[PDB]
Enzyme design. Sequence first.
Site, PDB file in Angstrom:
ATOM      1  N   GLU D  14    -106.444 129.416  59.973  1.00 52.85           N
ATOM      2  CA  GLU D  14    -106.505 130.069  58.668  1.00 52.85           C
ATOM      3  C   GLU D  14    -106.851 129.053  57.585  1.00 52.85           C
ATOM      4  O   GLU D  14    -106.256 127.979  57.519  1.00 52.85           O
ATOM      5  CB  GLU D  14    -105.165 130.744  58.350  1.00 52.85           C
ATOM      6  CG  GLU D  14    -105.202 131.647  57.122  1.00 52.85           C
ATOM      7  CD  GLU D  14    -103.971 132.531  57.001  1.00 52.85           C
ATOM      8  OE1 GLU D  14    -103.492 133.038  58.036  1.00 52.85           O
ATOM      9  OE2 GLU D  14    -103.481 132.719  55.871  1.00 52.85           O
ATOM     10  N   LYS D  15    -107.817 129.399  56.737  1.00 52.45           N
ATOM     11  CA  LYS D  15    -108.256 128.515  55.659  1.00 52.45           C
ATOM     12  C   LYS D  15    -107.486 128.774  54.370  1.00 52.45           C
ATOM     13  O   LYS D  15    -107.482 129.894  53.861  1.00 52.45           O
ATOM     14  CB  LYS D  15    -109.748 128.712  55.397  1.00 52.45           C
ATOM     15  CG  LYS D  15    -110.646 128.224  56.520  1.00 52.45           C
ATOM     16  CD  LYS D  15    -111.060 126.782  56.290  1.00 52.45           C
ATOM     17  CE  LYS D  15    -110.683 125.907  57.474  1.00 52.45           C
ATOM     18  NZ  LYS D  15    -111.792 124.986  57.846  1.00 52.45           N
ATOM     19  N   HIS D  16    -106.854 127.731  53.839  1.00 49.03           N
ATOM     20  CA  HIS D  16    -106.077 127.846  52.608  1.00 49.03           C
ATOM     21  C   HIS D  16    -106.476 126.812  51.560  1.00 49.03           C
ATOM     22  O   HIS D  16    -106.481 127.099  50.366  1.00 49.03           O
ATOM     23  CB  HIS D  16    -104.587 127.660  52.902  1.00 49.03           C
ATOM     24  CG  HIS D  16    -103.927 128.854  53.508  1.00 49.03           C
ATOM     25  ND1 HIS D  16    -103.382 128.871  54.773  1.00 49.03           N
ATOM     26  CD2 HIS D  16    -103.686 130.083  52.985  1.00 49.03           C
ATOM     27  CE1 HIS D  16    -102.837 130.079  54.971  1.00 49.03           C
ATOM     28  NE2 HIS D  16    -102.996 130.851  53.913  1.00 49.03           N
ATOM     29  N   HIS D  41    -110.391 133.779  54.446  1.00 46.25           N
ATOM     30  CA  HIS D  41    -108.946 133.918  54.491  1.00 46.25           C
ATOM     31  C   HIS D  41    -108.759 135.425  54.336  1.00 46.25           C
ATOM     32  O   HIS D  41    -109.566 136.086  53.685  1.00 46.25           O
ATOM     33  CB  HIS D  41    -108.313 133.175  53.309  1.00 46.25           C
ATOM     34  CG  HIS D  41    -106.837 133.398  53.169  1.00 46.25           C
ATOM     35  ND1 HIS D  41    -106.277 134.504  52.567  1.00 46.25           N
ATOM     36  CD2 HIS D  41    -105.796 132.628  53.566  1.00 46.25           C
ATOM     37  CE1 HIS D  41    -104.943 134.370  52.619  1.00 46.25           C
ATOM     38  NE2 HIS D  41    -104.601 133.245  53.217  1.00 46.25           N
ATOM     39  N   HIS D  47    -101.643 140.449  52.570  1.00 51.11           N
ATOM     40  CA  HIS D  47    -101.917 139.018  52.670  1.00 51.11           C
ATOM     41  C   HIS D  47    -103.197 138.666  51.917  1.00 51.11           C
ATOM     42  O   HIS D  47    -104.284 139.090  52.308  1.00 51.11           O
ATOM     43  CB  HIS D  47    -102.060 138.682  54.161  1.00 51.11           C
ATOM     44  CG  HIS D  47    -102.224 137.227  54.462  1.00 51.11           C
ATOM     45  ND1 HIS D  47    -102.580 136.741  55.699  1.00 51.11           N
ATOM     46  CD2 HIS D  47    -102.063 136.137  53.667  1.00 51.11           C
ATOM     47  CE1 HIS D  47    -102.623 135.404  55.622  1.00 51.11           C
ATOM     48  NE2 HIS D  47    -102.317 134.990  54.408  1.00 51.11           N
ATOM     49  N   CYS D 111    -101.313 131.493  48.144  1.00 52.00           N
ATOM     50  CA  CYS D 111    -101.456 132.602  49.078  1.00 52.00           C
ATOM     51  C   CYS D 111    -100.142 133.363  48.896  1.00 52.00           C
ATOM     52  O   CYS D 111     -99.083 132.748  48.811  1.00 52.00           O
ATOM     53  CB  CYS D 111    -101.582 132.084  50.512  1.00 52.00           C
ATOM     54  SG  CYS D 111    -101.511 133.382  51.760  1.00 52.00           S
ATOM     55  N   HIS D 114     -98.173 132.378  52.075  1.00 56.11           N
ATOM     56  CA  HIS D 114     -98.254 131.012  52.597  1.00 56.11           C
ATOM     57  C   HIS D 114     -98.092 129.898  51.570  1.00 56.11           C
ATOM     58  O   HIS D 114     -98.549 128.771  51.780  1.00 56.11           O
ATOM     59  CB  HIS D 114     -99.568 130.825  53.362  1.00 56.11           C
ATOM     60  CG  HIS D 114     -99.621 131.580  54.654  1.00 56.11           C
ATOM     61  ND1 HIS D 114    -100.695 132.367  54.980  1.00 56.11           N
ATOM     62  CD2 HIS D 114     -98.707 131.627  55.654  1.00 56.11           C
ATOM     63  CE1 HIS D 114    -100.419 132.875  56.165  1.00 56.11           C
ATOM     64  NE2 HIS D 114     -99.225 132.456  56.617  1.00 56.11           N
TER      65      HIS D 114
END
EC number: 1.15.1.2
Lengths: 124, 124, 124, 124
Positions: D14-16, D41, D47, D111, D114
């Site tokens: 997952e790209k954050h 993402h 989410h 996020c 996240h």
Amino acid sequence: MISETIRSGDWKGEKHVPVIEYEREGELVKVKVQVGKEIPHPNTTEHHIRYIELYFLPEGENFVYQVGRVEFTAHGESVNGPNTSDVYTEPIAYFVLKTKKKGKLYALSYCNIHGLWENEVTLE
Amino acid sequence: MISETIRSGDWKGEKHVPVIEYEREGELVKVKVQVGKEIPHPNTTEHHIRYIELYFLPEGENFVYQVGRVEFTAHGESVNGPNTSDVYTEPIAYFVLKTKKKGKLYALSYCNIHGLWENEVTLE
Amino acid sequence: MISETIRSGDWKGEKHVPVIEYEREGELVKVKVQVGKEIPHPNTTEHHIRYIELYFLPEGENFVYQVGRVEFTAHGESVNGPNTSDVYTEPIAYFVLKTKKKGKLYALSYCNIHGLWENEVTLE
Amino acid sequence: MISETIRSGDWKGEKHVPVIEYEREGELVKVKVQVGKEIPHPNTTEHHIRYIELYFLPEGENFVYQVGRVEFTAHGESVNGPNTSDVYTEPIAYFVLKTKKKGKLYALSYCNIHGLWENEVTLE
Ligand SMILES: [Fe+3]
Ligand SMILES: [Fe+3]
Ligand SMILES: [Fe+3]
Ligand SMILES: [Fe+3]
């Protein structure tokens, strides 16, 4: 015009119209704005009040001033799914305004699925 | 009504109305909103555009959606005085909206001393 | 790291550190955050606190949650010049958090010319 | 320290981390910040990336400046349920900064499940 997307109404029996209340103490004006006074508005990951903004147009003046903006950012979301974090921010906004002027206070709130809502009260 | 504080027409001499432009690429709608396109609006510590908000009301629907908000937070302020940081954020906002729907796009902007401003365009 | 731009310290001796205080009432946690408790921070068009944000990292968890953000948007600016509107928003933020969890509360505040400031307290 | 809640490295899957790119044109610095450039993402009601903030610390200076903040506010929510509006705001932020100074640019993103993420690049 944008006013066509903004709704208003009787807070005493609703759950979207932001209710404005204030108390003047010297040069200080403490303002409380909340959605869901009489009937609590849902605060779920899927349905919630995102923010409340307060504006002030001094009596006899031409330009409105944004006093503040309060964003409610926790709505139960978590890695375990919607409504599982046990962390929710209630739509209650407080603003401490320093002014000796009088005029009109306007509140603008946004529900994530029910659009924009407004209300106003005279600041004596 | 809060709408009584929102202007939709510029007065000759200073640009405030947020101009909306967009480009539809597949499922993506790239929207550019800006204040002072040709003749820039002042951007000083004392006078500047604070933010631009973008809204979308799908055709035939009853609730407007806030697409985004862009706050321009640098206006030259520094410990060495107003207009001395050489850091200014221009009132140009870009939003990447993913939708296949059509409707109306609204923009709301705020000048720190000239109140609220709006504009709208049909999203075809 | 952005942490190299964030400052912390003793609020009893400084005037930038956001002071966090809370009250647990049933399932509600009322949090008050303010800058300028002991020593009032200036609130002028040229120098002011822009906002205060509250975060919550529940005990034993991996991801922090943003509880809310309060923006103080009036700082005396007006068409008559800086510090002439007689309308100022004091840097006092109130958050109503609904949670039965315990953990750590973090406050992040931004001064327009003095950078980012932080503070934290254990939510018991 | 709040930094204990800010991540600077993605985990595979997952790209954050906000990716910062810029272009210098005269006195203008056009900055693009995005999350999930190569691998998107998620952007669902449950989410999604809430916002991206851009900061600038001029070389040799002591106080960071917030350049701007972009809030991505549409995530499919509607009266017909989560992920049903067909209106989503992608986490792509553009900032037009007017400065002749050099230094470091920082990006802070969030996020909803996240936590906080950061990145930085040298503004030459
Ligand atoms: Fe609702
Ligand atoms: Fe203006
Ligand atoms: Fe300061
Ligand atoms: Fe994520």
